[PDB]
Every structure is written in C-alpha cells, then in structure tokens.
Amino acid sequence: SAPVSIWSRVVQFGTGWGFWVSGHVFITAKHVAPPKGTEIFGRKPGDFTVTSSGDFLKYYFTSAVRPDIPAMVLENGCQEGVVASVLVKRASGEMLALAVRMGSQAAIKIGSAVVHGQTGMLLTDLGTIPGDAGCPYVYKKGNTWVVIGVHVAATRSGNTVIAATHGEPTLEALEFQ
C-alpha cells in the first residue's frame, strides 16, 4: 500500500529503528536511542539538536543527512478509527506493513515510564516483536502519506500496540469527572 521508497527512510538505530521524516528530521523511540552525546550518521553533537517528549525522540540536523528524500508531514497522532500502517523492518531487511486501527490518545504507563501516545489495535505471532520499537506509524491522509508516531510497546499476547507521539495533549487531555 505505502509507496515503495518510504521504506528506505526506516533504518536501524540504537536497539531499535528510526524514521526520516525529512532530510533533516529523524524520529525514534527514546528508549532505543544511543546515549545522548553519541555521534550519529557521521554527525557530532552540536551538528544536530534533540528534543524528547515522553518516549518520542526527534533529531534535527542543520545540514540535510538524507537530501534524497522529500519532507513528509509529522502529525501528533491521528483521529481515532484511522487504519494506519506500522512500517516494521526486521534486522534481515524484511519489510512488514502491519495494519492497525488507531485508538485513543492518552498518557500511558509502561513500566516505570509515562508515554504520551496513541493506542492501536493490530488487525491481524505475526505482530510486533521485541526489537521493533522506533518503526513509524503512517497513513494516507486524503491523497498523501503522513507519519503519526513511532512504535514503542505491545502486549505479549493480544493485538494492542502503542505509538509514541510528539506532543502533549490539549483537546485530548484526560481529566477526572
């Protein structure tokens, strides 16, 4: 479904994967990233800036690292009900697009961390596995592909997954009633 060229944007990173949103912007799961202050893609700290929000991590490079790729829209999650695709790469280079119905956005507790993200329900042993964190969630919005977050967590059994998103909630901020 997703354009063939989009997969070259998914690369190994730390103990997981990350995604080039543009030639300048690389997103990943905080928990898989190399330690802060590590040289990456041949660039030293200072040649890039890093922002984190929950388990979402974004690197911005002043000079393009991948000039061969057009910029894509990065959204803070998407509307509940959107059928998105997790672009999972495995170490072998195998590419597995996993259909997922996006659920609600919330601040989700995973172990000792709190992740701002969006829940999802895998539509199909053939889901995500340890090592997949950082792979992007994308969908075709109208007539263009947009990225909404990165894979961070799943249940062992069952089809629940969590994508970390870049923002903290306003309209989507949960409050006791």
Side-chain angles (χ1 to χ4, degrees), residues 5-78 80-124 126-137:
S5 68
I6 201 169
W7 288 95
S8 79
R9 294 179 188 247
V10 183
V11 300
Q12 287 193 74
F13 195 67
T15 55
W17 301 84
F19 183 71
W20 292 99
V21 179
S22 69
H24 296 259
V25 174
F26 184 78
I27 65 176
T28 187
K30 187 179 183 164
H31 78 270
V32 307
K36 190 159 152 294
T38 299
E39 172 180 340
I40 55 176
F41 313 128
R43 305 285 180 89
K44 299 177 184 175
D47 294 324
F48 60 87
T49 61
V50 183
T51 76
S52 57
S53 179
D55 200 37
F56 190 93
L57 192 62
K58 176 165 65 64
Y59 296 81
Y60 170 79
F61 297 83
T62 305
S63 297
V65 176
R66 293 281 307 271
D68 59 313
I69 66 182
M72 276 175 64
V73 170
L74 170 62
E75 280 184 354
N76 187 34
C78 64
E80 178 152 5
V82 166
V83 168
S85 177
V86 191
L87 307 185
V88 173
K89 275 197 179 173
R90 296 281 151 79
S92 70
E94 185 183 2
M95 295 158 284
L96 297 164
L98 300 182
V100 58
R101 182 200 186 273
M102 300 307 298
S104 321
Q105 298 181 28
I108 296 146
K109 164 81 85 153
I110 307 293
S112 61
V114 169
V115 177
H116 309 289
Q118 195 163 356
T119 63
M121 178 187 65
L122 292 179
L123 297 189
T124 51
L126 309 179
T128 58
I129 63 176
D132 290 346
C135 291
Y137 282 54

